[PDB]
Design a binder for this molecule. Structure first.
Ligand SMILES: N[C@@H](CCC(=O)N[C@@H](CS[C@@H]1c2ccccc2-c2ccccc2[C@H]1O)C(=O)NCC(=O)O)C(=O)O
Ligand SMILES: N[C@@H](CCC(=O)N[C@@H](CS[C@@H]1c2ccccc2-c2ccccc2[C@H]1O)C(=O)NCC(=O)O)C(=O)O
Lengths: 217, 217
C-alpha cells in the first residue's frame, strides 16, 4: 500500500490522514517516536531520513509506488488530483489556493507561540488575536457548505484541522461564529470521517512534539 | 491595469514582480513604506488594510479586474494559470508542488535567521547547512533546463529567487554546483527578464525590512 511517514503526533499531518481515510486509500503508516527531554532523540527518523529515496527528505512523506513526495501541501494536492478533490472552476481554484496558504500562516502563528519559552507570558497577547482570525474565516465561508464552493475539496481538510486546533486551544473561540461551528459538525459528519474518529488509528492529540509548551504529551 | 501591493523591499515578492514582467502584464505597483526606528510606522498600509475588499488582508496582494488575491503562492498560481505556466503532466505537477513548498521552507529558514538579534552569533552554523540545501536543489534539477521539466513554469521564478538570495548571503555557495549557476544565467537570460533587470522598476535589495539584521537597507 501507500506509506505515510510522520511523528506519532497530529502535528501538520491530520489533514493527510483524514484525506487518506475519506478516499478509502489503502495505506500503512510509519509513526516515528521522538525521545524525551532533554535530548529529544530523533534517531528513529534520522536512521532512515536519507535511505528512502526522497528528493528533499522531510516529514511527512508519502510513498506511492515509485512516487515519493514530501511537503504536506504537495502530498495533499497529489491525493486531491488522484481523487478529483480540487476546485473545478477558476473561482474554486483561487479560493482553494488562498485557503491552503492562509491555513499555513495560522498554523505557523500557533507553533511560534507553543515553542516560545515564554509561552505563558505570551499567551494573553495571542488570545486577543483569535477573534480576528476566526472572523476572517467566518466571512470567507459565509453561507457556503464548504470553503471552495458547493463541493468538498482538499482545502476543507486543511481548514477543519486548523479550526479544530484553535478550538482546542481556546474552546470559546467559535461561540460568536455559528457557520464555523456548523462547518466543524458537517465535516465530522462525513461518513468516512465519522468512522475514522472511532478507529484505532485516530490520533487527535498531542498536537505538538515533546519540545512544545502546550499539547506536547 | 492590475495592481500589485507590497512593501518597498524585495521581501517574498520578487517572484511575482518577475512573472508580471515575463508575461508582459499591464500592472502598476503600490510600494508601501515603513517609517524608521524606533516605531517603524506601518500606517501607510494599516490605514487601508481593511478597505481594499481583500478576503484575508495581507501583503502582497494582487488586484486583477474583479479578482482580489492575497498569499504569494496563490498570486503565483493565479498568474501561472492565466498565462499557461503550470506543469502539464502529473510528473511536472508533483515536481512543481514540492519545489513551491520547499522554496517557502528555505525562505522561512533565511527570514528566521535574518530577524534574530543573535544573527552574527547564528550565521556560522547557518553557513554550514547551506551546502546540503544547495546539493538537494542541484540533484533535483540534474540535467534539465528548468525545475518542472522541459518548459519554464512559475516554480522557476520561485527557485530563481531563493537561489539568488542564498547566493547574495554566501557568494560561494554555488561554486560546487554548476548546474545551479547555469540555471541562474539561463533565467536571467530570458529576454523580458534581462530588460527588467536594467529598468527603473527593478528592486533586488534590500531584501528585508529595517527590522532585519542583514539586507535591511
Ligand atoms: N513545510 C513542510 C514542514 C516540514 C517540517 O518542518 N517537518 C517536521 C515535522 S512538522 C514540524 C513538527 C514536528 C513535530 C510536531 C509538530 C510539528 C509541527 C506542527 C505544525 C506545523 C509545523 C510543525 C513543524 O514544526 C520534521 O520533523 N521534519 C523532518 C526533518 O526535519 O528531518 C511540510 O509542510 O511538510
Ligand atoms: N504567507 C504570506 C506571508 C505574508 C506576510 O507575512 N506578509 C508580510 C510582508 S512579507 C514579510 C516581510 C516584511 C518586510 C520585509 C521582508 C519580509 C519577508 C521576506 C521574506 C519572507 C517573508 C517575509 C515576511 O516576514 C506583511 O507585512 N504582511 C502585511 C500584514 O500582515 O498586515 C504570503 O506568502 O504572502
Amino acid at each position: 500500500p501507500m506509506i505515510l511517514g510522520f511523528w506519532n503526533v497530529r502535528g501538520l499531518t491530520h489533514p493527510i490522514r483524514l484525506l487518506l481515510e475519506y478516499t478509502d486509500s489503502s495505506y500503512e503508516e510509519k509513526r516515528y517516536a521522538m525521545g524525551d527531554a532533554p535530548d529529544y532523540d530523533r534517531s528513529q527518523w534520522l536512521n532512515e531520513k536519507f535511505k528512502l529515496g526522497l528528493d528533499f527528505p522531510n516529514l511527512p512523506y508519502l510513498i506511492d509506488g515509485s512516487r515519493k513526495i514530501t511537503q504536506s501541501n504537495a502530498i495533499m494536492r497529489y491525493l486531491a488530483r488522484k481523487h478529483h478533490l480540487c476546485g473545478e472552476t477558476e473561482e474554486e481554484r483561487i479560493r482553494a489556493d488562498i485557503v491552503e496558504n492562509q491555513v499555513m500562516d495560522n498554523r505557523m502563528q500557533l507553533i511560534m507561540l507553543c515553542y516560545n519559552p515564554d509561552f505563558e507570558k505570551q499567551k494573553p497577547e495571542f488570545l486577543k488575536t483569535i477573534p480576528e482570525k476566526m472572523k476572517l474565516y467566518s466571512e470567507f465561508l459565509g453561507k457556503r457548505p464548504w470553503f471552495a464552493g458547493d463541493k468538498v475539496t482538499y482545502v476543507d481538510f486543511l481548514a477543519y484541522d486548523i479550526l479544530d486546533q484553535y478550538h482546542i486551544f481556546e474552546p470559546k473561540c467559535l461561540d460568536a461564529f455559528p457557520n464555523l461551528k456548523d462547518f466543524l459538525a458537517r465535516f465530522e459528519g462525513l461518513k468516512k470521517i465519522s468512522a475514522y474518529m472511532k478507529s484505532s488509528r485516530y490520533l487527535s492529540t498531542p498536537i505538538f512534539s515533546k519540545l512544545a509548551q502546550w499539547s506536547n504529551k
